[PDB]
Design a protein around this nucleic acid. Structure first.
Lengths: 80, 104, 78, 162, 165, 232, 52, 438
RNA sequence: GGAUUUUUGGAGCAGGGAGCCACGCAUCGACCUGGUAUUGCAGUACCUCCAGGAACGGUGC
């Protein structure tokens, strides 16, 4: 898929991820798989109550991701 | 230069409000007090500036700023070029093609 | 910069005293000093290709100190 | 060596030992705190240790900044609108700076979440009643100079200064 | 690079202890990490790891016996190298406990070096006294303390102290 | 612009008379009177150097065509930022004087070096040295007062000193720039030489005597070009 | 490997391009550097038959 | 801290900024002129320069070169004026120290960075001359404020709103040009000849979005004019007039309740009625937004016309034409604001055969003789020597960066007899140290 | 082409009452006062025990 290619393009960039449960994970995208499975590092997580935490290493299953925010560095795939 | 700066600005702070003319006689650090020492000039600046702060000790309520900067703006090359041309031609004409008429 | 243009020379100079001459500074890998065929004599200007560019930029710096037959030698990049 | 977005953009960025996102601004000889906008509010705390800052002021609105390490600088004054630009400031380390008068510490009363405060190695420390003064004027602090603010001190600070 | 602290008030919760430890020790250099557990074995203790070695030595000398949460902390150089240091980085007597060398004169003296060496419970041999006052022979009961003294003045603006390797 | 030519001097006039006659306009740094050793008398002229150019100017205005010891004298230019001069001899023939302004405001160390080399106040300098490399439509190079071939020279600071800055550019003829590792060698430009920008430190300009520089250029050397005298 | 073979010689410079293909490099390395012996002429691998 | 020094530094910085934006206004008078002209049509009183000056782009005698850059510098001057306003604000709000100034006497430091770092912090122009932007606003980028179709204020992109509009009217009978024809309506037309019923939801929402756009565009394209001043002006006009500002000799007084009224009397006693209370209490924001769209579109009449023109042009283009034009808009958008045979022969000789050197940029070489010549080269030796592997024959074989590192590692103690006869193990320097000790 | 990362569903349902203020049940967690135990060189679900306090937090019905 076209969006998937753009996701792989964001590998190595800082991205934000919201899960199906609304926890919000911000940090560096290390690896993005075809099914949207996401390996990240040096995370800041913001829970539904508002509290924050810090994690070194995470991996989130694609299905249980609601969405991702990518840099605007990418915006400039205009062919489609 | 932080030392020099600081002493200049301090003696300038006090000098801005007799204390220095007494200090000199009471206490080679303040050698800038004489107009001989170059830095003296900059001193005359600082003091003036401080003297100015004492002026409107009144708020400034300044469009206007723009107008002002324009007026400041409002407040040679070609000539140099023409001169150059002249030098060229003067250097490049026959001063031996004489045809005189009279004499004084 | 690998090549230089060299003006103001005397035909008793040839490709050899250029070879020897500029390798005094640093080796001339490719020498070009025209031989004119018609009157069989040299106008005296040169083109020099070096190993790489660093040779030739140092060559810009040092290079114009050469004096061929009491006379001045032009060296500039190309 | 002005603080800069360019300076901030090449600065070591990492997850610290207490699991927070920290920006390393240490040892640049910065004199004035400015241009923090460029961090984009992405850090839990900023390490400004070993610099030449004179006043803790000049911050943009930074909602995520919770820890400020300001060791070995020249802080002699604290800005007045700090809570308006740093609402969740919870820890402030000011060790080895230049705060001299108890009244200069007054602006910290407005930092509602401030819980960890360290002012050691500041002349102000040797002023009579320095600890009780801080406790009464900045009651939101729970740990002062790495010692627990206790009830008895609160009461004692309520008498004096009541 | 790592200092071992003991005699700490074990009533402080672990995350608060680590955050105050980080704050307190940041004044000497970047602290890379802090290891502290509340097990029976490890309670009242912590390992503080610094990027720079000079930072560890300075911390050790300046905060020896600092009142922290009510008790005077006791600091010492750790027995082993921290896992994090070994990973960030990549002889049989080393670390040695006898540092002999010179390059430390300037009216320096034996009661001077004896008190600086004294700082350490390892204070065993101190040889600094001839017209020299610039040749220092320091025999420190153990290398944690020899290493503590050496790490404390590890760049006496540059003196030369050479373990008896 | 500090050195004046003074001609029409009666036999009785000497350096003392000149000092007394010109000091009313300002302090004087030097007075030179060429002598004929066969007669022991001067040749009727002298050069008076004022401390300030403004004073030299006032002197020209009030003393030119004035009377001294019964006869009319002639006074004119002989040839804050220092001004210096070089008197040039080409072959056996005097060519005239080049006057130069040194940009101490932009390149103080570079200007001071050249100034001292004009006055010889540090014990060595340009007097009697040559322009050893002269290329028409390009530049006239000199200042090699030790080896006379482009390999020598020395600054007042030691063998060599840093490039101060490249603020001043090679925009046209009549500019002073350092040959180079700055020592004492310099060149006077004979055209715009902008390919040297950022490579050589420009530090001054010709204010009088561009014509004398053109005479030097005309030898680009076919005849010896010598700095017969120099100073400030 | 032509890389590591260069660690076994006092003067590894002697090893060349085709040297790694030798039937016994582990010796020729030690011969070619022999004290007073002289190098092989270079006209081969040039197909020009030694002169023009 | 002596307040005198602080207030001083403040007045000085203010002076610096004024001087900066004045230097700017000097190099390119348009900066002011442009601005001032617009200001003229917002605050009628404003006095504007002689037309001749404007045209010839001159302030006194010298006509300056005509200059994206104008707008840029205008936004830069904008932030400058912000700084100035801040400093002005804070500002509105001896032996003892000279003794402490003696502190730390021994520092070998040159200090030429107070007025120079400021003067510099606010001046024109990289290493020397590449970017007009001052260090103060070095990360200022217009493309993050203007889209490509707006061309830094030349046009306003209304195609998007034409889309939304199609979505609003629930049809397609409306063309881009007919939509612009609709916009033109916006002192009485937009009120008495509305495209749609002014109580329609879709319509009011659209109008809101559009209004917002026009306003932001307005202030975006004219940074130099005081935004707050304009805002307040419009608001006061809204409150004090927009009071039966629309009057007809026949129907009387219109109310934005959408009804007329015989006389002012019934009009006033209608402004307290439950109806008007309801409406003014529900449709207030919309009415106000409508009004803003009105006055801001009036202030931008020249831009509106300019764009409509553009539309008609592009529309009357061909394919190639439209393409080249787009190319132009694009270039303007992404441009710096300140410009500076022997077949068997090569096999026989061994050339045109694929090969690679690893240490050099993973470079490709087409011949073995050539690659053998790579071993002596400028770049190859630069990679070696700058890599820390010294350039000599020794290494004139292997290509990969790694192996030559261990090769270079492969490339790169006396006894002075102490008097106790044990120092035969003792080093020279050590025994000299015991000379200094002895 | 309905069997774990998308399109043939794990969804569905449950909060007002009392006089701006306050709230049923169950589970888990720090947590707060006192007092008390331990002086131990580590890389961690948590980490002494004893008594008292919870107008604390999260989740489900």
């Amino acid at each position: 898929g076209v969006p998937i290619k753009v996701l792989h393009e964001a590998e190595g960039h800082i991205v934000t991820c919201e899960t199906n449960t609304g926890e919000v994970y911000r940090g560096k995208l290390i690896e993005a798989e075809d099914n949207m499975n996401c390996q990240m590092s040096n995370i800041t997580v913001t829970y539904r109550d508002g509290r924050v935490a810090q994690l070194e290493q995470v991996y989130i299953r694609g299905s249980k991701i609601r969405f991702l925010i990518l840099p605007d560095m990418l915006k400039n795939m205009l062919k489609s | 230069s932080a030392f020099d700066l600081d002493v200049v600005k301090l003696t300038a702070q006090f000098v801005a409000r007799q204390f220095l003319t007494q200090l000199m006689q009471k206490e080679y650090q303040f050698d800038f007090l004489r107009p001989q020492h170059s830095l003296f000039n900059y001193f005359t600046k600082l003091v003036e500036q401080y003297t100015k702060i004492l002026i409107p000790p009144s708020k400034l309520k300044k469009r206007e700023v723009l107008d002002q900067v324009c007026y400041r703006v409002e407040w040679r090359k070609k000539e140099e070029e023409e001169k150059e041309k002249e030098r060229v031609a003067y250097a490049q004409i026959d001063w031996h093609d004489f045809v005189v008429v009279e004499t004084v | 910069d690998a090549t230089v243009y060299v003006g103001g020379l005397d035909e008793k100079v040839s490709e050899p005293l250029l070879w020897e001459l500029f390798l005094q500074a640093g080796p001339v890998v490719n020498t070009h000093m025209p031989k004119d065929r018609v009157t069989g004599q040299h106008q005296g200007y040169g083109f020099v290709e070096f190993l790489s560019e660093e040779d030739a930029d140092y060559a810009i710096k040092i290079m114009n100190m050469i004096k061929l037959y009491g006379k001045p030698i032009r060296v500039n990049k190309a | 060596v002005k603080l800069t977005a360019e300076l901030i953009e090449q600065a070591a960025q990492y997850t610290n030992a207490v699991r927070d996102r920290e920006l390393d601004l240490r040892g640049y000889k910065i004199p004035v705190i400015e241009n923090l906008g460029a961090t984009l509010d992405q850090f839990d705390a900023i390490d400004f240790s070993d610099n030449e800052i004179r006043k803790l002021d000049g911050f943009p609105l930074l909602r995520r900044l919770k820890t400020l390490l300001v060791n070995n600088n020249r802080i002699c004054r604290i800005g007045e609108g700090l809570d308006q630009a740093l609402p969740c400031l919870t820890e402030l380390i000011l060790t080895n700076n230049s705060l001299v008068e108890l009244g200069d510490l007054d602006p910290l009363a407005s930092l509602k979440s401030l819980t960890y405060l360290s002012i050691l190695r500041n002349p102000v420390t040797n002023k009579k009643h320095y600890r009780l003064y801080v406790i009464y004027k900045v009651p939101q602090v729970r740990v002062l100079d790495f010692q627990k603010v206790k009830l008895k001190e609160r009461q004692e600070a309520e008498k004096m200064f009541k | 690079h790592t200092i071992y602290i003991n005699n700490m008030n074990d009533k402080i919760k672990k995350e608060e202890l680590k955050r105050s430890l980080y704050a307190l020790f940041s004044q000497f250099g970047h602290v890379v990490d802090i290891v502290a557990l509340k097990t029976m074995k490890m309670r009242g203790q912590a390992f503080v790891i610094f990027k720079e070695l000079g930072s560890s030595t300075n911390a050790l000398r300046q905060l020896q016996g600092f009142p922290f949460y009510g008790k005077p902390m006791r600091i010492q150089y750790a027995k082993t190298d921290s896992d994090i240091i070994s990973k960030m980085r990549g002889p049989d007597y080393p670390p040695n406990y006898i540092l002999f060398l010179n390059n430390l004169p300037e009216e320096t003296n034996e009661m001077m070096l004896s008190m600086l060496f004294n700082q350490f419970p390892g204070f065993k041999e101190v040889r600094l006294v001839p017209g020299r006052h610039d040749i220092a022979f320091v025999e420190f009961e153990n290398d944690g303390q020899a290493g503590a003294a050496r790490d404390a003045l590890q760049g006496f603006k540059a003196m030369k102290i050479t373990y008896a390797k | 612009k500090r050195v004046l030519y003074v001609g029409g001097l009666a036999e009785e006039v000497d350096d003392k008379v000149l000092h007394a006659a010109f000091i009313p306009f300002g302090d004087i740094t030097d007075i030179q009177i060429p002598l004929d050793y066969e007669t022991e008398k001067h040749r009727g002229f002298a050069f008076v150097e004022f401390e300030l150019a403004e004073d030299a100017a006032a002197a020209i205005d009030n003393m030119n065509e004035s009377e001294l010891f019964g006869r009319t004298i002639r006074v004119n230019l002989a040839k804050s930022n220092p001004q210096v001069y070089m008197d040039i001899k080409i072959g056996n023939k005097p060519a005239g004087r080049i006057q130069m302004l040194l940009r101490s405001d932009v390149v103080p160390m570079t200007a001071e070096n050249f100034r001292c080399l004009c006055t010889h106040e540090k014990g060595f300098g340009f007097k009697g040295s040559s322009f050893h490399r002269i290329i028409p439509q390009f530049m006239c190079q000199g200042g090699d007062f030790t080896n006379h071939n482009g390999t020598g020279g020395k600054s007042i600071y030691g063998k060599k000193f840093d490039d101060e800055n490249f603020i001043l550019k090679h925009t046209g003829p009549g500019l002073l720039s350092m040959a180079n590792t700055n020592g004492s060698q310099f060149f006077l430009t004979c055209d715009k030489t902008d390919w040297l920008d950022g490579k050589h430190v420009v530090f001054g300009e010709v204010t009088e005597g561009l014509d004398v520089l053109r005479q030097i250029e005309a030898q680009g050397p076919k005849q010896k070009v010598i700095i017969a005298d120099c100073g400030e | 490997t032509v890389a590591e073979l260069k660690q076994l010689v006092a003067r590894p410079d002697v090893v060349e391009m085709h040297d790694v293909t030798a039937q016994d490099p582990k010796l020729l390395v030690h011969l070619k550097a022999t004290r007073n012996s002289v190098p092989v002429p270079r006209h081969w691998c040039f197909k020009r038959k030694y002169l023009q | 801290e002596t307040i005198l020094e602080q207030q001083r530094r403040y007045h000085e910085e203010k002076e610096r900024l004024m001087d900066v934006m004045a230097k700017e206004m000097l190099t390119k008078k348009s900066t002011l002129r442009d601005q001032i002209n617009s200001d003229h049509r917002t605050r009628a009183m404003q006095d504007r320069y002689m037309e001749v000056s404007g045209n010839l782009r001159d302030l006194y005698d010298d006509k300056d070169g005509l200059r994206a850059e104008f707008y840029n510098r205008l936004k830069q001057i904008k932030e400058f004026h912000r700084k100035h306003p801040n400093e002005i604000c804070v500002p509105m709000s001896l032996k003892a120290r000279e003794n402490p100034s003696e502190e730390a006497q021994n520092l070998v430091e040159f200090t030429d960075e107070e007025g120079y770092g400021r003067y510099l912090d606010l001046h024109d122009c990289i290493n020397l001359k590449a970017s007009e932007k001052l260090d103060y606003i070095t990360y200022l980028s217009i493309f993050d404020q203007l889209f490509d179709i707006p061309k830094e204020r030349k046009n306003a992109e209304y195609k998007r709103y034409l889309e939304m509009l199609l979505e609003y009217l629930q049809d397609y009978t409306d063309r881009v040009k007919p939509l612009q024809d609709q916009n033109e309506l916006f002192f009485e037309k937009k009120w008495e000849n509305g495209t749609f019923p002014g109580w329609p939801k879709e319509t009011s929402s659209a109008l809101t979005h559009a209004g917002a756009h026009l306003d932001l565009s307005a202030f975006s394209s004219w940074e130099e004019l005081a935004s707050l001043g304009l805002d307040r002006l419009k608001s006061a006009l809204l409150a004090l007039g927009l009071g039966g500002t629309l009057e007809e000799r026949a129907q009387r007084l219109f109310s934005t309740k959408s009804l007329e009224s015989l006389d002012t009397s019934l009009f006033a006693k209608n402004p307290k009625s439950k109806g008007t209370k309801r409406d003014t209490e529900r449709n207030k924001d919309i009415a106000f937004l409508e009004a803003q769209i009105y006055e801001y579109v009036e202030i931008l009449g020249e831009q509106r016309h300019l764009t409509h023109e553009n539309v008609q042009r592009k529309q009357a283009r061909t394919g190639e034409e439209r393409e080249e034009e787009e190319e132009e808009q694009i270039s303007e958008s992404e441009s710096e604001d300140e410009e500076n045979i022997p077949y068997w022969l090569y096999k026989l000789h061994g050339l045109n055969i694929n090969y690679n050197c690893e240490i050099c940029g993973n470079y490709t070489y087409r011949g073995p003789k050539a690659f053998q010549r790579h071993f002596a080269e400028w770049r190859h030796a630069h990679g070696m020597r700058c890599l820390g592997i010294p350039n000599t024959a020794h290494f004139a074989n292997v290509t990969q960066i790694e192996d030559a590192v261990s090769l270079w590692a492969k490339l790169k103690d006396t006894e002075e007899e102490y008097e106790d006869s044990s120092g035969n193990v003792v080093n020279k320097k050590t025994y000299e140290d015991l000379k200094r000790q002895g």
